[PDB]
């Protein structure tokens, strides 16, 4: 995850909090250090290879210091709710083929020009019901979108029973109309699915989609049967994978930039971020200005990430520490 | 009234103070707008064409912010009192020609510093007393300076009788001794005059003067007879014309800089300052610093005018709102 | 590794001839230990900067 930097960015994992430079026993222990006359601030961190300190922060040249919670970084997955238009017809047409189209916007390549379309076709029948049509439509999408041969996950598709009205019924390529025993299906949800991830090689990305419809003859005129609607998301990709790449990136400023170039002849960097966790982040923006002519600023950032137990204890304790040592006020989250 | 600028000046008229953006209905309606954290301040003003917003003021970069009472911008009209000194002679000496001079520092139509005179002749005879002298000297002055022939005198002449001592008796190029029938005239007062003003062509301006007396022979000695003392002014010149010009010039910084140049092919701007009203002014000097390597300051100022009604009510409320919004401590009038 | 140095002079030193000069033990490349004198203060600044 290559990012933009305001001339530098540096990261320190606050696994623990020790209150003294003496108590820095294990990696990830961090202490905020500021003199009584609050003019400088820095952090003594315990590295896999010994103690280490961060650049000193002039409490006069600090621009913004803010803590961001884990949920702020959790990508809510876009989910649509496609139903058939009660205007055209509240029920399927006897002998029409309903072909739903899912145009995917950012496919393998970065650009919006890298398009990819997936279809779900359902030829309706006399006596067919709406629930039965949603059933078959979702199953067709499953075979096309939730198949196992697809190179990359594309979308999740569900079903909702009016009786439930909130529970989403998964519909996978193994599912079959015998397993979907209901008659009050209202809609078809199509949700965004998390793409893969690799530290330093595949950043956390997504591929978005819009559902498009083809036109059916309802009396004698071509018309669209469906209305695609965006409803509140309910799934979120957690922060663990972003912070990890952030550390994989921001530790090359404090150290080795040749992360792996030179395979036998390299210098491995041990990391302290577990991508299976949820960290709250804290960023401080500050600068250095020189003397009598070197007034040009050098804006800099020092980021601290702490795991969230659900109530932001590690960070709130870290905030109290920095605030009582620096006189700052960083608005505990 | 072309002025000197610290890279910009912008003027907005506070014809009415409203609490919200929704209440901006008439042109001149204004509301100070600042966030709850008090990071930036801006003004939403109703122009004849929709609401316009001012520049945003980073409330950390405010250099100064003071308001004026509308009495500071008023110009008192200078007036002397001429009198013949009892030292030389408490009454005119016969045969001597008394010639009074009015030393102006500019011409009537020009602003460059020059020496410009106007004269008044009187030749004294055996019976002429002080009253008759002031009378004939005043009429001579009027006929010599009130030879305008187009517009208006350059100074105004009056006489004061010892009985009144406060009632200025006007003298014009038409006056004649038959109109002046008193015998207790004791001085001559000469006030400055409000010269022609045009909105963006002729700035408000005055031409000071000094009554100088030439030499007469009294006992074989050439001597000066007069006493040009400076009595306190009684008339004033408000800022309406002065402010209106400020608007006319400072509206070319957000509007059209040409104003009548390509006369058929122009853009005409509507101005909300009422020349004839008295405005109390407010001003906020601020700057924009910038990013890395871009420390150079772009200093700016936003000034606001509001009619005074004796008590500076309008401006006092406007600043009270601005202090409530931006937390500043601007002082009231 | 990277090394830097600086030195600020007031612009009024452009050609400030020195009154008496400043004798110095200046060293050449190898045949060094040449005693020299600074008539202009710039020559003395230039030599130690280098």
């Amino acid at each position: 995850m290559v990012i933009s930097i305001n001339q530098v960015r540096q990261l320190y994992v606050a696994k623990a909090l020790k209150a003294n430079t003496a108590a820095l026993t294990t990696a990830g222990d961090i202490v905020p250090k500021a003199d009584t006359a609050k003019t400088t601030l820095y952090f003594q961190s315990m590295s896999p290879a010994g103690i280490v300190a961060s650049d000193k922060i002039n409490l006069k040249h600090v621009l913004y210091a803010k803590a961001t919670p884990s949920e702020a970084l959790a990508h809510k997955l876009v989910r649509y709710s496609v139903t058939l238009d009660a205007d055209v017809s509240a029920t399927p047409v006897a002998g029409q083929n309903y072909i739903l189209r899912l145009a995917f916007r950012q496919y393998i390549g970065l650009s919006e020009e890298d398009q990819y379309f997936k279809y779900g076709e359902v030829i309706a029948r006399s006596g067919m019901t709406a629930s039965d049509f949603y059933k078959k439509m979702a199953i067709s999408l499953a075979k096309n979108l939730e198949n196992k041969t697809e190179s990359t996950p594309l979308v999740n598709i569900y079903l909702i029973s009016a009786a439930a009205a909130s529970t989403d019924v998964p519909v996978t390529s193994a599912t079959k109309e015998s397993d979907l025993t209901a008659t009050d299906y209202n809609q078809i949800i199509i949700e965004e699915t998390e793409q893969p991830w690799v530290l330093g090689m595949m950043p956390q990305a997504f591929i978005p989609f819009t559902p498009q419809f083809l036109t059916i003859t309802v009396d004698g005129e071509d018309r669209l049967w469906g209305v695609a609607t965006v409803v509140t998301p309910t799934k979120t990709v957690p922060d663990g994978h972003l912070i990890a790449d952030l550390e994989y990136f921001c530790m090359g400023a404090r150290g080795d930039i040749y992360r792996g170039m030179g395979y036998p002849n390299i210098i491995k960097t041990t990391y302290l971020v577990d991508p299976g966790a949820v960290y709250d982040v804290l960023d401080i923006h500050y600068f250095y200005t020189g003397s009598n002519e070197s007034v040009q600023k050098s804006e800099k950032t020092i980021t601290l990430v702490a795991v969230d137990d659900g109530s932001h204890t590690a960070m709130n304790a870290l905030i109290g520490a920095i605030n009582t040592a620096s006189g700052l006020t960083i608005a505990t989250l | 009234m072309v002025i000197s600028i610290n890279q910009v000046r912008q003027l907005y008229v506070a014809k009415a103070l409203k609490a919200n953006t929704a209440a901006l209905t008439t042109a001149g309606d204004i509301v100070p707008k600042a966030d709850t954290a008090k990071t930036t301040l801006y003004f939403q003003s109703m122009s004849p064409a929709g609401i316009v917003a001012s520049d945003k003021i980073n409330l950390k970069h405010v250099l100064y912010a003071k308001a004026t009472p509308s009495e500071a911008l008023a110009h008192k009209l200078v007036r002397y009192s001429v009198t013949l000194d009892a030292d030389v002679s408490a009454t005119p000496v016969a045969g001597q020609n008394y010639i009074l001079r009015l030393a102006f520092r500019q011409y009537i139509g020009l602003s460059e510093e020059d020496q410009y005179f106007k004269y008044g002749e009187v030749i004294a005879r055996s019976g002429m007393t002080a009253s008759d002298f002031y009378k004939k000297m005043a009429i001579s002055l009027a006929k010599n300076l009130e030879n305008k022939t187009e517009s208006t005198p350059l100074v105004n002449i009056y006489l004061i009788s010892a009985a009144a001592a406060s009632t200025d008796v006007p003298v014009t190029s038409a006056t004649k001794e038959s109109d002046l029938t008193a015998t207790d005239y004791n001085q001559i007062i000469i006030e400055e005059t409000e010269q022609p003003w045009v909105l963006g062509m002729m700035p408000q301006a005055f031409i000071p003067f000094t009554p100088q007396f030439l030499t007469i022979t009294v006992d074989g000695e050439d001597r000066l007879w007069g006493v040009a003392t400076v009595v306190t002014p009684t008339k004033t010149v408000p800022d309406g014309h002065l402010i209106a010009d400020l608007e006319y010039f400072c509206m070319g910084a957000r509007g059209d800089i040409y104003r009548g140049m390509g006369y058929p092919n122009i853009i005409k701007t509507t101005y909300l300052v009422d020349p004839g009203a008295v405005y109390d002014v407010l001003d906020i000097h601020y700057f924009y610093t910038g990013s890395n390597e871009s420390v150079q300051k772009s200093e700016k100022t936003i000034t606001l005018v509001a009619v005074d009604d004796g008590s500076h009510t309008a401006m006092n409320a406007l600043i009270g709102a601005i202090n409530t919004a931006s937390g500043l401590t601007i002082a009231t009038l | 590794t990277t090394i830097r140095i600086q030195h600020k002079v007031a612009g009024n030193k452009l050609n400030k001839k020195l009154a008496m000069g400043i004798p110095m033990v200046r060293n050449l490349e190898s045949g060094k230990q040449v005693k020299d004198t600074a008539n202009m203060w710039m020559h003395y600044v230039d030599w130690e900067v280098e």
């Binding site: - | 072309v2 008192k76 200078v78 520092r105 139509g109 020009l110 000071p208 | 007031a10 009024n12």
Partner: protein, 50 residues
């Protein structure tokens, strides 16, 4: 107050109407910072008929 004054300037010289004039902008001989500014004026026009 410049000019080596140690006593001040009487108020009489500091009253409405006292006209002032620009003389020059002096600076240091060492490490002088920018100072001064220039001035501009506009013309007028007169007209006459045949």
């Amino acid at each position: 107050l410049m000019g080596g004054n140690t006593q001040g300037v009487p108020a009489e010289r500091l009253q409405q109407g006292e006209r002032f004039s620009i003389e020059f902008a002096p600076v240091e001989k060492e490490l002088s910072r920018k100072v001064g500014d220039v001035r501009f004026t506009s013309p007028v026009s007169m007209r006459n008929e045949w």
